[PDB]
Design a protein around this ligand. Structure first.
Ligand code: MG
Ligand code: MG
Ligand code: MG
Ligand code: MG
Ligand code: MG
Ligand code: MG
Ligand code: MG
Ligand code: MG
Ligand code: MG
Ligand code: MG
Ligand code: MG
Ligand code: MG
Ligand code: MG
Ligand code: MG
Ligand code: MG
Ligand code: MG
Ligand code: MG
Ligand code: MG
Ligand code: MG
Ligand code: MG
Ligand code: MG
Ligand code: MG
Ligand code: MG
Ligand code: MG
Ligand code: MG
Ligand code: MG
Ligand code: MG
Ligand code: MG
Ligand code: MG
Ligand code: MG
Ligand code: MG
Ligand code: MG
Ligand code: MG
Ligand code: MG
Ligand code: MG
Ligand code: MG
Ligand code: MG
Ligand code: MG
Ligand code: MG
Ligand code: MG
Ligand code: MG
Ligand code: MG
Ligand code: MG
Ligand code: MG
Ligand code: MG
Ligand code: MG
Ligand code: MG
Ligand code: MG
Ligand code: MG
Ligand code: MG
Ligand code: MG
Ligand code: MG
Ligand code: MG
Ligand code: MG
Ligand code: MG
Ligand code: MG
Ligand code: MG
Ligand code: MG
Lengths: 263, 134, 158
RNA sequence: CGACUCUUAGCGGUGGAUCACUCGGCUCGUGCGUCGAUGAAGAACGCAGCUAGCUGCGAGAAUUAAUGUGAAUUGCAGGACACAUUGAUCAUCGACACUUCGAACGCACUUGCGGCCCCGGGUUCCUCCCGGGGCUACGCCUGUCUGAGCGUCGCU
RNA sequence: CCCCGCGGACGCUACGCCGCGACGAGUAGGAGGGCCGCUGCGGUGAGCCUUGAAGCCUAGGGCGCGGGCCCGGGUGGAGCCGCCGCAGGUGCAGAUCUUGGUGGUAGUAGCAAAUAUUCAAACGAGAACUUUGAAGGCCGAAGUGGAGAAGGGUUCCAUGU
RNA sequence: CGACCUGGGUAUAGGGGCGAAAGACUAAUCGAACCAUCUAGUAGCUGGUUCCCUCCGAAGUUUCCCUCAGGAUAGCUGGC
RNA sequence: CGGCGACGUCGGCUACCCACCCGACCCGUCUUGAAACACGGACCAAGGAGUCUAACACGUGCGCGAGUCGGGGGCUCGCACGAAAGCCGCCGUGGCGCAAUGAAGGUGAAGGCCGGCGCGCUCGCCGGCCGAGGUGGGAUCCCGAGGCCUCUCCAGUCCGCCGAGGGCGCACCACCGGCCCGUCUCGCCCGCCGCGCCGGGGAGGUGGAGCACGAGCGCACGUGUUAGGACCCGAAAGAUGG
RNA sequence: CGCGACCUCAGAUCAGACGUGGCGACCCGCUGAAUUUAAGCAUAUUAGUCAGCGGAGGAGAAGAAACUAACCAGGAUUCCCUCAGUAACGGCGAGUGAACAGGGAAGAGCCCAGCGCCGAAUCCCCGCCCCGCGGCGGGGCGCGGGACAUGUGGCGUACGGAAGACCCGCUCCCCGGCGCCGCUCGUGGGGGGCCCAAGUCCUUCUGAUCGAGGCCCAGCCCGUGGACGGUGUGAGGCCGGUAGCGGCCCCCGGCGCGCCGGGCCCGGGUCUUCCCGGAGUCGGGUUGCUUGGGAAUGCAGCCCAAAGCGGGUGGUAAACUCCAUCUAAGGCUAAAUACCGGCACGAGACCGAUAGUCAACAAGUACCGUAAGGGAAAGUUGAAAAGAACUUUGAAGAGAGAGUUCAAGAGGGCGUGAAACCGUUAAGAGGUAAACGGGUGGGGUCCGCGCAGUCCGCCCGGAGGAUUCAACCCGGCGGCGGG
């Protein structure tokens, strides 16, 4: 808010022997404003309590290792059909979920052939879901230029932009991402992992250089290596049912002993 | 979408420019589509509405194929008056009903040296775009 | 009032600090403006190095940093004298010169004149009038071999 | 039985909460970064066919010219406007114009009064009257003209 | 080696489900939970909506210990909500609180300083108050008279409402 | 009939004026006018401090303090 | 097992009105004590008060880990989003941590066992190994005599459970030793380009926010304290210029 | 006893110029408090801050060492990070508090006086002629004026410079112009103007629709355009726009070539001989302020008052000694940096008419005060005025009919229309003021598809229908296992 707001009044308190509250009152006469309360957060036309200020620390810094971690988690989750469908991405006729297309897509020039590619990849149902979800936002966002809202569609991750950006970019829901500049705000759109992603082949081949293997470090980040697992085998049912685990267990106590009525 | 950093997409700014537009750009705002026959004869789609050209009302209470000659372009109220598009008020006098020009279709153009100059200007630019994208 | 264990803190907020607060919301815009000016300058000086003149090898003063070597303000006049470069011609061919720096030893002096000799050998000098090359450089050496160097000229390494 | 009073509901009042709207603000960022004696900022008074305010303008006064545009302006009226022996309106704005105060400048002001030079009229050149026009502030620089000094000298 | 039967309830959102035992006051104060509530942002609901959004009203039906919430009816006429996160100018009975509105008081106090009005007529829808006439009175020339200065600024004068 | 009453014009301005003196008067303000700002001045003092349920649950005592309507300190409390 | 059931009755009621019995003083607030003859409150609507910044402390979550952190800069079509994100590594400068102690000059954290020798003189030259000592507790872990079985036995084949005792002992606690810096007391040796008013070393006390095989750094959240208008409202005053 | 020259002054409505005043967010020079904190308070703090005064510009100021250092040395200024809440100051209390080095943004250097040399080489003004007008210049002329030896210009400035010799290299600058440029350069440079894709298709909802279904072909059509706004809903295709190294028109500007014209004048190395510096200033004392600067950091007043192998600094006063480092008392200078005023834009996890600016509106308005100054309230009919013709009562306000509209249960302060409060109607009640908790009862309004009361699995019996069952064959697909 304006730092001058509510404090342009020259008002002063009337004292205490005049049967009115000791709030400052506007000086003078001849107007409705005269004798009215001022400067208080409880006063109409006064100053708000603790006025908001521009030095509010709007920004946060996150460690580069944690930001790299989140990209790795987002990419790994976008390879599992259960997680992508739980985002709601209509990947039912998609032939393979780490969906990779040839490099010819990077040189597309028309929106017509971008649409045709998505239809033949069976990714057009995700676009139709974005169309169905175009509605008006509820609230004051309409007055503040955020009038339309819609769903997020697939993410096209390319390596070299030879017109692919312009061929897309008129399809609602499509966001295009350079593989060298991956964004967590686009890969996990609402903070939830599992966005549908379509990879160009050159982008797909470049992931092992960008983030590395566990055998070799990344060749494009100069100190980064893939994070380790604190649990190698997450198949809990397989572990519990394994004969070595079952050999060490005592027999289950599956009889319920309810309260005995004392006769 | 819009990428020009000097063109605004702010709703308040756009509405302010619309409702406070000077009359010489209110002329361009108050444009109308041409009929399918005129859109074929001249390679143009739209045209600013004019005091003496003939239109059909295609939306509202006065829909129909009746051709009416425009009789007044009221740029202050963003409406045009057409010949038979009128109603009786209480005392029994006829008053024209204002209609936005975007809801009419021009069927005959009032032609003069300026209209033909604009019509060929719009057609030439459309042809240049056709041969650019060819 | 103090409460249990703590640190005796002395904040310097007794002096109406809120009237002099520098926010940094124009930091991303300042980085853009600086970057654009850098690009515009590099375009202006077409084949010349984009960074600027070549700077000398300089040892850092104190006992904390005398094991370190960085770039200085300009070549001293004794260095240019034994490199055979006029102190007024040096600035026109991209050699920075610092007339107020002396040379206490011959090791740093000789290291900087080797630097000047190597730069003078790497230098392509376009003729003042392109039609008539007087003493600058052969046309083959400047036909396509002249590119804008990026980064400091011959960067100083430890 | 009514009246009165209380409670609840329907309807009607009084009132303007709520919600929805927003040509307004606030905040951040960018690019420019430009007033004035060739008279600024500000103020006053005027200016429209019907007009009080706001807005615009200056006795050429809700505007002239020029350029772009290309048939309106509009609340009513009136009247143009072959749109080619050129054009409504709007925009732009480089030509022209721009009352009185105001640093405000002949002197002075809660009033008013000069002086000088030209021009015209009553005169029918001589200087009185009327009107018109141009000048008439302070400080200061360069130069100019006119000067002052029992200042320092020279010739006589 | 089950087989004339080829068959056999539910469960286990593991942050879930189940069992047993004891316990239950509370100011100042602390902590936890909140599928309590408000506003906005990122996701999501192939969400809702002119065959009717928000808001409001309701002797309507209910749910929850509660904060509150859902549904029916009416009015209204254009936007709104659920879930996962994020962020607050986020919840009122008080502050002789601020602004606005409204009561009782109450058809009450009151419309009582300087003697005083009455008759007839006219106009007019309408007359205690206007106008005219007739009376009776007052100011009583240091005036309730006739003119000015300051101040006001059109109040002056006609006509009309 | 006087140290008389009074118009207008002038002069004196805030720690200043002016006072036949009452701390009087100085634009309904005077034992220091009014206006704006410093200023959201400070307050150990008064008033208020906005949803629900569950669990735990006090102190008015010790020592020091220009300390006695306040703090620090130990104690008592809750949470992890 | 019985009765009863459509234009009159059946069930329901949180909710509407009324009646009766019992109980029941008006809330907020300060206070030992409020219904108070204590203060505020006529009524309704809307607004209305622990906030943000900085700095600490501890807890909690996350990443990396003797390190950690790019926050300032730069590079990446300059720009819908994007003022975002990404990257730099001879951009790690630097901050904090990794070393303390003394006013400072300065100095600055490895011992244990077995051997031959001067004298195994409270000890100096080495050897060999090992690599932060020991005592008492100490989760966990290891060994384990002896038992627990079948239709039965003379005789071992494979492993599962209980198990007196014994062992290695995490973290942590108590204690005793040891090492580093300051300062005392006592005392005898050693070094040499500077033979010195030089330098080093020992033993026994004592002072340190120390060592004794690291735990920190960055980010986020919570609570507490503090400086800021600082939970909100409130002086009598003071100052500057009109 | 006049006339001249000079010096020092004066006047003029003399010829030609310049200054004043405004704004003042940022900047420079001064002046300068107190509230406050210290739990009192006086030093201190607030704070070199508010207020006051003066002066500028698009930036300003600063700035090329009388510097930092003590190193193996760096090298103008300004800004950022860090140094660092540190050294230091402080009733050593509360509190205050820099710099160097290091890393970056930017980067740029110079000019006089003096000492000297050169026939004052120099400059201003007024006339005349010519080329052009644009920030009035060039060229030429004037036995035309003036300035100026009480010192103009060229060389030259501490980084040394100058003059002679000797040797080497002839090397090539600036400005105004004609024609054309490549045209400028993240993809024309800038400003202005005019244009450029695709549904108003079929059936329906509605007052109106931009709504809802559909549009066989791989899917209505365009998409480098699915930003936004308008339009009687909610629109990529209705309109303006949006996208595009899209098009067309006009104007302006800064980089080259061929040529024109004008000025335009020697550079380096070695040797020799010469020449070298800013004074009521430094510095000292004292006083007051200021600073982190502490036996005194800086500034100023007064007094004293310099030197030249000198002077300044070397963060503890002083003497002696060595060393290091710079060269004061003259001047200019871009960039990086700042910007709550102005012009023009863009955006937002902001506010949504008691909020957000005081001001969404004829707001610094109305109004108040003598004045300085103080300073509001106030948004919404409807898609369209279609703003209620006409009849009737009344003097009118106001009504009853009628009419418009989807709606006036939208009627010019007119979207919705809460509560308090009030009128009327309906029901109930009423002598312990009302109101409340618990428990019932009566009445009432509604609800229940209430009114012969669930349902469905197997079996038995009855009477009926049937892509008719098991087992086999063919094919397809799965699950599990295989040295
Ligand atoms: Mg406000
Ligand atoms: Mg809402
Ligand atoms: Mg009502
Ligand atoms: Mg014109
Ligand atoms: Mg007079
Ligand atoms: Mg004389
Ligand atoms: Mg109990
Ligand atoms: Mg309890
Ligand atoms: Mg609040
Ligand atoms: Mg209230
Ligand atoms: Mg009465
Ligand atoms: Mg009376
Ligand atoms: Mg009488
Ligand atoms: Mg009189
Ligand atoms: Mg009168
Ligand atoms: Mg007295
Ligand atoms: Mg106050
Ligand atoms: Mg008390
Ligand atoms: Mg109280
Ligand atoms: Mg008491
Ligand atoms: Mg009480
Ligand atoms: Mg009592
Ligand atoms: Mg009392
Ligand atoms: Mg009290
Ligand atoms: Mg009271
Ligand atoms: Mg009250
Ligand atoms: Mg409220
Ligand atoms: Mg970044
Ligand atoms: Mg380092
Ligand atoms: Mg132990
Ligand atoms: Mg010990
Ligand atoms: Mg604490
Ligand atoms: Mg406060
Ligand atoms: Mg005082
Ligand atoms: Mg003159
Ligand atoms: Mg104090
Ligand atoms: Mg105090
Ligand atoms: Mg005090
Ligand atoms: Mg000031
Ligand atoms: Mg000025
Ligand atoms: Mg400057
Ligand atoms: Mg300067
Ligand atoms: Mg110098
Ligand atoms: Mg530190
Ligand atoms: Mg200070
Ligand atoms: Mg740089
Ligand atoms: Mg000279
Ligand atoms: Mg629309
Ligand atoms: Mg649209
Ligand atoms: Mg179009
Ligand atoms: Mg365009
Ligand atoms: Mg010393
Ligand atoms: Mg307001
Ligand atoms: Mg409202
Ligand atoms: Mg009336
Ligand atoms: Mg309605
Ligand atoms: Mg209404
Ligand atoms: Mg009622």
């Amino acid at each position: 808010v304006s730092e001058l707001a509510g404090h342009q009044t020259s008002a002063e308190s009337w004292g205490t022997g005049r049967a009115v509250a000791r709030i400052p009152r506007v000086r003078g006469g001849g107007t409705h404003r005269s004798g009215q309360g001022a400067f208080g957060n409880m006063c109409r036309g006064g100053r708000m309590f603790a006025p908001t200020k521009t030095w509010r620390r709007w920004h946060r810094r996150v460690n580069t290792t944690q930001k790299r971690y989140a990209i790795c988690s987002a990419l790994a989750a976008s390879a599992l059909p259960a997680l992508v469908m739980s985002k709601g991405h209509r990947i039912e006729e998609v032939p393979e979920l780490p969906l990779v297309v040839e490099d010819k897509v990077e040189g597309y020039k028309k929106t017509k052939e971008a649409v045709l590619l998505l239809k033949k990849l069976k990714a057009w149902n995700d676009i139709k879901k974005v169309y169905a979800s175009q509605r008006m936002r509820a609230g004051k966002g309409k007055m503040r230029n955020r009038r339309r809202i819609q769903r997020r569609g697939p993410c096209i991750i390319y390596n070299e932009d030879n017109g692919i950006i312009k061929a897309f970019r008129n399809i609602p829901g499509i966001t295009l991402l350079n593989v060298s500049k991956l964004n967590i705000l686009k890969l996990a759109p609402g903070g939830h992992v599992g966005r549908f992603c379509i990879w160009t082949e050159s982008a797909f081949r470049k992931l092992d250089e960008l983030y590395g293997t566990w055998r070799k470090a990344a060749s494009l980040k100069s100190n980064y290596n893939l994070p380790m697992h604190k649990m190698i085998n997450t198949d809990l049912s397989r572990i519990l049912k394994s004969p070595e685990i079952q050999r060490a267990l005592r027999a289950p106590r599956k009889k319920i002993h309810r309260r005995v009525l004392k006769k | 979408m819009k990428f020009n950093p000097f063109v605004t997409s702010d709703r308040s700014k756009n509405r302010k420019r619309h409702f406070n537009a000077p009359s010489h750009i209110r002329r361009k705002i108050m444009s109308s589509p041409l009929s399918k026959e005129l859109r074929q004869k001249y390679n143009v789609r739209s045209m600013p509405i004019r005091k003496d050209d003939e239109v059909q009302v295609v939306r509202g209470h006065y829909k129909g194929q009746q051709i009416g000659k425009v009789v007044q372009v009221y740029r202050k109220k963003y409406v045009i008056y057409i010949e038979r598009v009128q109603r009786e008020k209480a005392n029994g006098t006829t008053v024209h009903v204002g209609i936005h020009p975007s809801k009419v279709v021009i069927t005959r153009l009032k032609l003069d040296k300026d209209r033909k100059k604009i019509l060929e200007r719009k057609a030439k630019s459309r042809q240049v775009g056709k041969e650019k994208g060819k | 009032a103090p409460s249990r264990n703590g640190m005796v803190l002395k904040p310097h907020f007794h002096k109406d600090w809120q009237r002099r607060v520098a926010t940094w919301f124009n930091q991303p815009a300042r980085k853009i403006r600086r970057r654009k000016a850098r690009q515009a300058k590099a375009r202006r000086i077409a084949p010349r190095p984009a960074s600027g003149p070549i700077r000398p090898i300089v040892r850092c003063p104190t006992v904390r940093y005398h094991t370190k070597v960085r770039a200085g303000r300009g070549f001293s006049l004794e260095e240019l004298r034994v490199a055979g470069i006029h102190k007024k011609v040096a600035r026109t061919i991209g050699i920075s010169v610092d007339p107020r720096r002396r040379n206490k030893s011959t090791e740093s002096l000789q290291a900087n004149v080797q630097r000047l000799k190597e730069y003078r050998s790497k230098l392509i000098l376009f003729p003042r009038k392109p039609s008539a090359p007087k003493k600058g450089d052969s046309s083959a050496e400047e036909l396509k071999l002249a590119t804008q160097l990026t980064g400091p000229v011959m960067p100083v390494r430890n």
